[PDB]
Amino acid sequence: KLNLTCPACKVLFTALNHGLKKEPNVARVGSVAIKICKMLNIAPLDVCQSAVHLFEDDVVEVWTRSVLSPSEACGLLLGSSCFSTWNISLPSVPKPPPKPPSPPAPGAPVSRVLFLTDLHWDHEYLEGTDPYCADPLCCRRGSGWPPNSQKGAGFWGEYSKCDLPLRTLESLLKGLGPAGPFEMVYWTGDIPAHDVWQQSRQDQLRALTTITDLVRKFLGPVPVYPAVGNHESTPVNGFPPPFIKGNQSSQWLYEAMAKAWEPWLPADALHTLRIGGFYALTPRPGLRLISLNMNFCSRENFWLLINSTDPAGQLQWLVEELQAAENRGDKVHIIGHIPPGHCLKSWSWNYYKIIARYENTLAGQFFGHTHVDEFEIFYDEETLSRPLAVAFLAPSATTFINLNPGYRVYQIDGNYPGSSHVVLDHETYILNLTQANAAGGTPSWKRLYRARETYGLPDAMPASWHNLVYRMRDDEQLFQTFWFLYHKGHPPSEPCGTPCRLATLCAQLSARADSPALCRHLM
Ligand SMILES: *[C@@H]1O[C@H](CO[C@@H]2O[C@@H](C)[C@@H](O)[C@@H](O)[C@@H]2O)[C@@H](O[C@@H]2O[C@H](CO)[C@@H](O[C@@H]3O[C@H](CO[C@H]4O[C@H](CO)[C@@H](O)[C@H](O)[C@@H]4O)[C@@H](O)[C@H](O[C@H]4O[C@H](CO)[C@@H](O)[C@H](O)[C@@H]4O)[C@@H]3O)[C@H](O)[C@H]2NC(C)=O)[C@H](O)[C@H]1NC(C)=O
Ligand SMILES: *[C@@H]1O[C@H](CO[C@@H]2O[C@@H](C)[C@@H](O)[C@@H](O)[C@@H]2O)[C@@H](O[C@@H]2O[C@H](CO)[C@@H](O)[C@H](O)[C@H]2NC(C)=O)[C@H](O)[C@H]1NC(C)=O
Ligand SMILES: *[C@@H]1O[C@H](CO)[C@@H](O[C@@H]2O[C@H](CO)[C@@H](O)[C@H](O)[C@H]2NC(C)=O)[C@H](O)[C@H]1NC(C)=O
Ligand SMILES: *[C@@H]1O[C@H](CO)[C@@H](O[C@@H]2O[C@H](CO)[C@@H](O)[C@H](O)[C@H]2NC(C)=O)[C@H](O)[C@H]1NC(C)=O
Ligand SMILES: *[C@@H]1O[C@H](CO)[C@@H](O[C@@H]2O[C@H](CO)[C@@H](O)[C@H](O)[C@H]2NC(C)=O)[C@H](O)[C@H]1NC(C)=O
Ligand SMILES: CCCCCCCCCC(N)(P(=O)(O)O)P(=O)(O)O
Ligand SMILES: [Zn+2]
Ligand SMILES: [Zn+2]
């Protein structure tokens, strides 16, 4: 026991964790925290110096606490004095024995799938403004001007906490020629910018109509299959389950999507889309595309306080779609915005259980939301050792934060009977702002890398990505590459030390939220 109250403990972790974000050592930061404790009379210094001694005696205990923040660490140290359970009904049909997808045979075609996510169009982006304003979003009207001649916001964007003007997005679509042709496109939400404090419903629908028409303009007859992001509504993250009716429901948003996305989605899809913002359709024989609204898994969605149990019956709906694909022989692609690893515990554990059951039917999982080049591996529930699926977390088109613009393209097993529809390889394209915003610089999108090439993989199967993680656990050079691509070729100046490495690698193995057992082989 420590004579340390709940708010008191939060002041220390604040002054420490904020300090540990760039300060070289713990000692100097430890002194600041003790001085804070003294100046404000927050607690007895013996207790304060005892807490600093524990918060990070070594980085290991804190390596587990890499996720932990003040409220999260205090609860564990103080106790209870400082989210419901539920699960899904799986059909009684016995699980087919696991068998890997057969590699494509000679002559089997390939298909290219463009993947767009996190475009975050800022209607108010303005060149020359201050990229480091006080607001959560800058490079826009109201952020001010730079101080004493410092460089303002770049023309095509900036490496800061800023989003993109329409110019950079129009430039992205126009230069897709070399990346295609595309059989279809996946678009996992987050269309508006991060100007939350001034997002009316008119603004959000303006971003939907404006970007939808733009995408449709440069893709033309190619179908685009979108998924609902967490910024698409106002207030942000607020997606009430369909049991809420009236002007406070998300119908203003869902009925606007069904109208804007009608060219791409069939009747049955729009039906569910209007109700809960999710749908399922058949884009080609043998394949079933399922678009999930991961806002109903979101931690920021305050609406789930009413009933966080499978909101909208989506997972139960997902199970039915998956089980029907299994009986039919089809394979499944799931698209969403928030990756399952970032979901609420119950929702995530149930999704993890669903993916484990239908491993032979699932051929691809695609998400975004992280804005960086990541991937989440799923393991068998019985032993948590056989990688059986992969969720590719594509990088954002926007710069938010301190990143290069970029999109993703997937090579999948082609459109033919018996195909596995699995991802065979993928590529990432970027816009190099340092060259585009420079005097005389012109937009030129280039292929950053191809996965199988840089990583030397035999394929894009779960076992290969599983083997790529532990190769990076022991190969500092192979991880730096991944770390370089992680940020779309614009890493932070802060090198990723051995605690950062294992933390990043632990994210690659944690497709289930709150499961430390998934990273037991990292130290
Ligand atoms: C956890 O910390 C608690 C707070 O710690 C303080 O806060 C930090 C920021 C620093 O300032 C640090 O130095 C402090 O210690 C701490 O709470 C303290 O606990 C002690 C005893 O456990 C309390 O002592 C008692 O105080 C009362 C009130 O004192 C004054 O008021 C009355 C009238 O209201 C007057 O009559 C008194 O003369 C005082 O002017 C006293 O009444 C009481 O004395 C009586 O009882 C004792 C024995 O019980 C007899 O010897 C006396 O003769 C009296 O009969 C105590 O002296 C202290 O008030 C309390 N302070 C605060 C701010 O809460 C706590 O002890 C720590 N907990 C643990 C588990 O360590
Ligand atoms: C909470 O909702 C669950 C989930 O069902 C959906 O929730 C609402 C949106 C509501 O409008 C229903 O029409 C939806 O179907 C309710 O039922 C649970 O359903 C899930 C599977 O989808 C299952 O895991 C649970 O065991 C079910 N529980 C029950 C009691 O049927 C449930 O009615 C709501 N529970 C609470 C406590 O609010
Ligand atoms: C959630 O948890 C368990 C899964 O192990 C389920 O317990 C079964 O409950 C159903 C009724 O819904 C019964 O048919 C089964 O007989 C129960 N268990 C066994 C071993 O028979 C539970 O039903 C699951 N489902 C839900 C909706 O929570
Ligand atoms: C429906 O709900 C909206 C949600 O905000 C109500 O609020 C108005 O609309 C915008 C967003 O669309 C808000 O930013 C404003 O605060 C509100 N309007 C104004 C002029 O400030 C809206 O009033 C509701 N609509 C109806 C018709 O009742
Ligand atoms: C984007 O373009 C910039 C500018 O051409 C590249 O930055 C250079 O990187 C080399 C690497 O050794 C440095 O020596 C130069 O000083 C950098 N130039 C500037 C102006 O900073 C950058 O490498 C390019 N990024 C990608 C992903 O292609
Ligand atoms: C250099 C690595 C850091 C990248 C920055 C990531 C920002 C994340 C944005 C959000 N997840 P999204 O909902 O906009 O996707 P948010 O929830 O923070 O808004
Ligand atoms: Zn985003
Ligand atoms: Zn998002």
Author numbering: 82 to 163, 169 to 609
The authors write:
Acid sphingomyelinase (ASMase, ASM, SMPD1) is an enzyme found in lysosomes and in the extracellular space where it catalyses the conversion of sphingomyelin, a major component of membranes, into ceramide and phosphocholine. ASMase consists of an N-terminal saposin domain and a C-terminal catalytic domain. To gain insight into the molecular mechanism of ASMase function and the interplay between its domains, we determined crystal structures of the full-length protein from mouse that reveal a conformational flexibility of the saposin domain. In one conformation, the saposin domain adopts a globular closed form independent of the catalytic domain, while in the other conformation, it assumes an open V-shaped fold that establishes an extended interface with the catalytic domain.
As observed with other saposins, ASMasesap adopts either a closed or open conformation depending on environmental conditions. In the closed form, ASMasesap is compact, globular and interacts mainly with the CTD, although this interaction appears to be a consequence of the crystal lattice since the two molecules in the asymmetric unit occupy slightly different positions, with the linker between the domains disordered in one molecule. In the absence of membranes, closed ASMasesap decoupled from ASMasecat would predominate and render the enzyme inactive. To further these efforts, we determined the structure of ASMase bound to a known high-affinity inhibitor, 1-aminodecylidene bis-phosphonic acid (AbPA; half-maximal inhibitory concentration 20 nM)24. One phosphate group of AbPA completes the coordination shell for the zinc ions whereas its nine-carbon lipid tail sits in a relatively featureless shallow groove. This structure and the position of the leaving group-protonating His280 allowed us to propose a model for how sphingomyelin might bind to the active site. The fatty-acid chains of sphingomyelin sit along a hydrophobic track that extends from the edge of the active site to the saposin domain and surprisingly, do not correspond to the position of the AbPA lipid tail, which instead coincides with the position of the choline head group. These results will help direct the rational design of new ASMase inhibitors that better exploit the shape of the active site.
